[PDB]
Amino acid sequence: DLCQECEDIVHLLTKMTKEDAFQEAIRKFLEQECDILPLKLLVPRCRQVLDVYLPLVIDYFQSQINPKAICNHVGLCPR
Amino acid sequence: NDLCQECEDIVHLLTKMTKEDAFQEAIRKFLEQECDILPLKLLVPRCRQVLDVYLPLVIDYFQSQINPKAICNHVGLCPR
Ligand SMILES: CCCCCC/C=C/CCCCCCCC(=O)OC[C@H](COP(=O)(O)OCCN)OC(=O)CCCCCCC/C=C/CCCCCCCC
Ligand SMILES: CCCCCC/C=C\CCCCCCCC(=O)OC[C@H](COP(=O)(O)OCCN)OC(=O)CCCCCCC/C=C\CCCCCCCC
Ligand SMILES: CCCCCC/C=C\CCCCCCCC(=O)OC[C@H](COP(=O)(O)OCCN)OC(=O)CCCCCCC/C=C\CCCCCCCC
Structure with missing residues (x-):
């Protein structure tokens, strides 16, 4: 049941994004990844993209x- | 505060969903559509080829x- 699993992931994300620890952890992880491959090459100006879009x-x-x-x-739930 | 368990739950859900071909097909279509428009079209050079190579991986x-x-x-969501 893909639809329900996607809905569950969305629910979990809504819960996790409420904690400042989550933001800090993902920020640090992605800042580390932006300075190395593959992201360093796949995403130009990785750190600035991160700074702007993670809060959003x-x-x-x-x-x-x-x-x-x-x-x-x-494409994981019908209409 | 129990972010660790929520992260483990998301990972388990992802492991279950990636078992279905319908999942790969749907996410492929969605990201192929997104690669041709903003923001991805600009944020990720050669978006479609990056997708083709990395989605199976x-x-x-x-x-x-x-x-x-x-x-x-x-x-960083479980301590060690
Ligand atoms: C590039 C190839 C990389 C290989 C695969 C690695 C995957 C990377 C994930 C990056 C995907 C970026 C997609 C950006 C597209 C986008 O901005 O659309 C979001 C739109 C636009 O919202 P608004 O303009 O604000 O108005 C509607 C208000 N609700 O919002 C949405 O409705 C869709 C939200 C997508 C998040 C859903 C997450 C649910 C989880 C599903 C299963 C997990 C797979 C997730 C893969 C990525 C798909 C988002
Ligand atoms: C570009 C930043 C924009 C900010 C908005 C973020 C929007 C979408 C997320 C973009 C996805 C980019 C992720 C970069 C992944 C990357 O290149 O790292 C490679 C590494 C190399 O793998 P290995 O060393 O072999 O693993 C051994 C560990 N057992 O990948 C990894 O380690 C695995 C990371 C996957 C983490 C996903 C777990 C799901 C947990 C929570 C979901 C909610 C948070 C989502 C953000 C996490 C993005 C991965
Ligand atoms: C990994 C599985 C975890 C599942 C969790 C889902 C993770 C991320 C969901 C994506 C978040 C979507 C929410 C949308 C909310 C919103 O308002 O943002 C929409 C905005 C709309 O953009 P615009 O305002 O139009 O900007 C135009 C100016 N350039 O879109 C976004 O936020 C998307 C930004 C994400 C940036 C993606 C960059 C990374 C892409 C690909 C990296 C691929 C690496 C793969 C390596 C794998 C190695 C094996």
Whole structure:
């Protein structure tokens, strides 16, 4: 049941993004990855992209989202 | 505070989902669509080719002999 597993992942992400520890951990991990391969080459200006977009993703998962619509958008739930 | 367990749960869900071909097909279609538009079109040079090369590798990685706690340790959500 892909739809339900995707919805569960979305729910878990909504829970995890509420903790500052989560943001700090993912920030440090991605900052380390941005300085080495593969990301260093695959994503130009990796660190700046990270600085700008990690807070936006955190906010997004803390906002009023529609899990079934999200999972439909990526093709894992029907409409 | 129990981020470690939530991370392990996400990893387990991903391992389950990567077992289905419908998953690979759907994520492939979604990311192929995204590679042709903003933001990815600009953030990831040669997005479509990067996708073609790396999506099977990520799928295999989550289908392989992995330890969810080890992944979560690597990304800093379980302590070690
Ligand atoms: C490039 C190839 C790399 C190999 C694979 C490695 C995967 C990397 C994941 C990067 C994917 C970046 C996709 C960015 C596309 C995007 O910005 O669309 C998000 C849109 C736009 O939202 P808004 O403009 O704010 O308006 C609607 C309000 N809800 O939001 C969505 O509805 C979709 C959210 C996607 C997150 C869903 C996560 C659920 C988990 C599913 C299973 C796990 C697979 C995840 C793979 C990535 C797919 C997101
Ligand atoms: C570019 C930053 C933009 C900020 C927004 C973030 C949006 C989407 C996430 C972008 C995905 C980029 C991830 C880079 C992964 C990478 O290149 O690292 C390679 C390494 C090399 O693997 P190995 O050393 O062989 O593993 C041994 C450990 N047992 O990959 C890894 O180690 C595994 C990392 C996978 C972690 C996923 C676990 C899921 C946990 C929580 C999900 C919620 C957080 C999502 C962010 C994590 C992104 C990976
Ligand atoms: C790894 C499995 C974990 C599953 C968790 C899902 C992880 C990430 C979900 C992605 C977050 C989507 C939420 C959208 C919320 C939002 O408002 O952002 C939408 C914005 C819209 O962008 P714009 O505002 O239009 O900017 C235009 C100016 N350039 O889009 C995004 O946030 C997406 C940014 C992500 C940047 C991706 C860069 C990394 C991409 C590919 C790296 C591939 C590495 C693979 C290596 C694997 C090695 C084996």
